[PDB]
Amino acid sequence: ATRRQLANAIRVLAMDSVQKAKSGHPGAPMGMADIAEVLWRDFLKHNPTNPKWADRDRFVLSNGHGSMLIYSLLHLTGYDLSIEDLKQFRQLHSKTPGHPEYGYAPGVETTTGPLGQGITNAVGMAIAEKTLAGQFNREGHEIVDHHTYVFLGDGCLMEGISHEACSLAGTLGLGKLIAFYDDNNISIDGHVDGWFSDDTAERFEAYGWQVIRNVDGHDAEQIRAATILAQAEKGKPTLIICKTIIGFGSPNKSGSHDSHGAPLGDEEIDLTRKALGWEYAPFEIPAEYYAEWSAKEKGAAAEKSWEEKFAAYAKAYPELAAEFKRRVSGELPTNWAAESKAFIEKLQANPASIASRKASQNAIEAYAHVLPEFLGGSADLASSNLTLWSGSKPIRAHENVGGNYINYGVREFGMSAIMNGIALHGGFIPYGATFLMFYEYAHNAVRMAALMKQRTLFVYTHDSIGLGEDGPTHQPVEQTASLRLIPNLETWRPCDQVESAIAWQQAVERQDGPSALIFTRQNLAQMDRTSAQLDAVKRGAYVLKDCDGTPELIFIATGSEVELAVQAAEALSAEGKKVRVVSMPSTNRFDKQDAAYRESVLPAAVTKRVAIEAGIADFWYKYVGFNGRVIGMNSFGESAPADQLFKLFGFTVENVVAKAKEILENL
Amino acid sequence: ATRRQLANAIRVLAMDSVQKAKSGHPGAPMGMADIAEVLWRDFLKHNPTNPKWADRDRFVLSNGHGSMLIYSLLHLTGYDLSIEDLKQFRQLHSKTPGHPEYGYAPGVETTTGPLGQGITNAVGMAIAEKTLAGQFNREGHEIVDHHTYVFLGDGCLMEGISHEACSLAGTLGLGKLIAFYDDNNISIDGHVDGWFSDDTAERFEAYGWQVIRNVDGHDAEQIRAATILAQAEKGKPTLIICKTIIGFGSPNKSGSHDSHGAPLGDEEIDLTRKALGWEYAPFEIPAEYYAEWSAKEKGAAAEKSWEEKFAAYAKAYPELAAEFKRRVSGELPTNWAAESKAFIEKLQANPASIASRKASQNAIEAYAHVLPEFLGGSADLASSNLTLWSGSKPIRAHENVGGNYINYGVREFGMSAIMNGIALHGGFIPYGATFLMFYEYAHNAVRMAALMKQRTLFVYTHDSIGLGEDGPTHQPVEQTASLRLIPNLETWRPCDQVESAIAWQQAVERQDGPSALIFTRQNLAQMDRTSAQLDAVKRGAYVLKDCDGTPELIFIATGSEVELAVQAAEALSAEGKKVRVVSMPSTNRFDKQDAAYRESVLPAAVTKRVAIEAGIADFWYKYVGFNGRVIGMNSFGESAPADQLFKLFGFTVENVVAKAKEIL
Ligand SMILES: Cc1ncc(C[n+]2csc(CCOP(=O)(O)OP(=O)(O)O)c2C)c(N)n1
Ligand SMILES: Cc1ncc(C[n+]2csc(CCOP(=O)(O)OP(=O)(O)O)c2C)c(N)n1
């Protein structure tokens, strides 16, 4: 078959699957099929029988609405994705959801859909390849060597996150990143000139990318020539601008947004088959086409060759090879359990009153000696977030290439989605920090990490009005509660240096999802814990101060407000009242405990509960109920020194005691 | 005094005010003082005695950490901002908070701090000036004509939102937008080459801006020359790239991130004074420097000249002039109360089972006939969000310049912060739509509108698993609850075309803060309402179905789930149980009602409550407590037809009734 005939197999599988589903986007798959045929058949290094081969090239479909493009490519080249799977497009519990989801189909490298995060994940994947190569490759043993390929569209380039990711990609000289731009002059609102008129070539040249302009996206020889010059450029990422016709082959809907996101219809599909010269019924692919699309034989030989290279590498570098396999698998070092425990116990036995952001740095310093896979960073806030340790080596294009730290610049969304790509790639545990407030810039990347069950460590410092004079644009109020609502994210707001080391430990051990670690600017007093209390911190909430017998009142506190809760409990106790203090470093972790443990912390029979947190109050009714009270925030902050703000907003022993006594008096 | 001596007044006030607070950022004010002297003394058209002069130029400090720069300028040029105010920098209730706040000091045009949003607000103000000029100017009567000036630094240019805002600004040809880039090679991590190496000039030329390269930021003559060329360019926004030395004047910390964000120290301040030849004690500005900095005489003449132009305009176009004054003040038209009421009563009388996104478009259509100040838009989703009405005139650089709609492209964050600038400018009520999921892209701009108490209307469609097959990356679950947590935002989730029209009405009428209006893709059944029920919808929650006497079970539902709550209540009432259905289209609005009203709707003695909402369940404990139940979500969605998703996730009458019996 001809290259165009092979590409048409994608076009027809796409429009037939959308039609059977009565749902989906036929246009971009049809527009990009010729580019896909060249890239997948001539260049992409992959093995359909092992989609987890460590040295495979990574392909990312950033215009994720064109999901039938990747589904067709995976089916045609030999992956474990069947015609029956394509017939279940957009159906409940199928392998082929409306937007491609990591973990659902073999060979989908990332979950896309939200525009701009695809290319940003890919930037992270290319950073991880370059850094892993810098850490593990040796002379004669280039065991890390693979490209990162991206398809992207107009929406992706309009999104601000594309500017964050691609500006950084150029600075870091990601020569193995090659992106194909689907330049079809179409978005949902119509022909894009009215709202999108960048000179995109000049924009990307300004980032330090190589740009190959004006490629005919339906001419295989041109796509091939451009890909060759893209691969020959070793120092810069490359953008190949492909001129395509959206919905190529449709006589009445091509070149128009009418083909972007609706079924073509039975009549138009017939007219398309004829304009394409495609004579086979829906979901029928001739055996000849499967034979020429198959990547099984080329892929198996590529991996067997890499396995032989790795075998020889392991003889020369036995510890590197073991570390490679360990880190790529995501397992922790065998001494991790004992050294992290010993560090946490040392802190419990050597009290220090420090800011939890300092405790965070101390934890990084200790754990980084055990975890060479740490790949840390900050969005231009290293000296405020305290993310550097004594062994930090900031990565640059030609310096510290096997380093372990990224100066992300002022790019919270880009950093967060890059970290997702780093986590997806394997070999690293990424962490990256900013101020808690600017979680809101990166919000959807955090949710994406949770949806993809990726171990990405989101570090946030300056967590409340405790930060003081920078004022209400910076002082978080509702941000912690908002992070707590993200399914499959575990949010930690530790109350001293010990809870801070335990939150880091729990985040590192959480391999099926991300964590958010929230730290303070101001000093926090360390709480006393018995061995059993120390063991219970990782359960998310535990009894910190207890009375003899059933409590008449329970204080629930997190983070910097735990000392206040303890002091108010002391005052009430000196009046003969029986009060319990529960510290709740992670509401998410506590919610997962069995009902016996939760009842032992918050007994159902004790309904007089006071929650204390310098955050939005509405969150806490889940734990205090109608008979409880929340000592929280219900407004934006103010610019003033922190001690005056804590008094202004009621975080005083007098106020807490007074509010507690009101519910004890049933008022 | 020389120009440099006048600029040094900014430098010494900045560093002395930061030193007294023991907090703040001296470097950028010190780095930009010469630029600010030129722009404010030679070019800025403004009146310190009336910071609300409608035709004033707009200045925006996008690198807002340098707040002492704008406070010094305001103090020096004669605004109502005193030395005593600068002495209260960063102190409780001062007019000089650590980042400039709109309304806290006269002459501050927007609240900055979150990097990138200042320039994006300024793109919004430049769009509003251009569009308002297109609507109101007449031959011989150019009553709208003013520039938008921005200071911005490396952080702003690194942020993705700057790419959204400046791309659109070039496309719309905002010739009166002029930005000065504080190109000082410094950010908090240090010298920026290791993480920021853009060819910024070529980047902005790719957006269609004019770029003046390599201006010496400490040479008043070059700054003046660059600004003249920026003003001469009428068709494109201009970026003036000013090479500056952060902390200019400090011998030990200039050109270093050491001067970015901490007091210089008493000793370093003394050496800086010596290096600058500055001989006056802290907070002492000689009378001669005040006289030469004063904008009072120039500004009063400029406003008087404009008042005379407006008087001539009002003589020729009395109705137009009265519309200008009404729309700039923010007051609604006199017939608004009656027209909106008649529209809502008409919908209650002619039931239709339509998607609330279609109900939203119908409301836009009816209200836009009454509100010429509407400036609508969508982030590349006009056909899905349904934001166009029959009178929509999409604004372009040279077409529909007096239009009323913006194709924002795929730029949710930039859209939202541009809308904030449009609201700050005056003359418009901006609304803008995207899918509910992608408010997470625009999150902090929504918060900033609430912080600034701006009437910005954030429209969201496709609000639940109800959108169906696009799957869990698009299906909101926790987004509505997160919107509800934002102080001073009112979030509405209406259950039918009638609640949809009332939600738009209340958002339009809310002058002191923003609204989020959340609409469905799937059809919603209209509910029966008496005249008193119809009137109570604007109280945020109300009794929709009531039993006789005290109920033993209260259903609380919102949006698309109210019909399910009605259906389950009818099944339970047919069994003899006393059940009430409460529709709660806005939790935030309801929370602000007086105690008597709230008790009338949710009596405290009825503790058996079931909340129903296709969103994160944990939010609703505030209203149901320990002994209630939530028919909610606690996971991500799935890619499948909507009808199957509602069954899969338990949004069925049988499931709701089962959970109601668990507490009865
Ligand atoms: C952040 C975000 N905003 C909006 C959308 C909705 N959306 C999906 S595709 C699309 C149009 C973008 O067009 P383009 O990328 O050029 O694709 P084409 O129509 O050419 O296939 C939009 C707005 C989204 N997926 N993500
Ligand atoms: C979105 C956002 N992220 C982070 C910050 C914190 N921050 C304030 S200033 C700054 C450094 C930016 O440097 P630049 O704008 O070049 O300022 P300079 O030091 O030159 O005055 C950062 C990261 C912020 N205000 N907003």
Ligand SMILES: [Mg+2]
């Ligand atoms: Mg397109």
Ligand SMILES: [Mg+2]
């Ligand atoms: Mg700078």
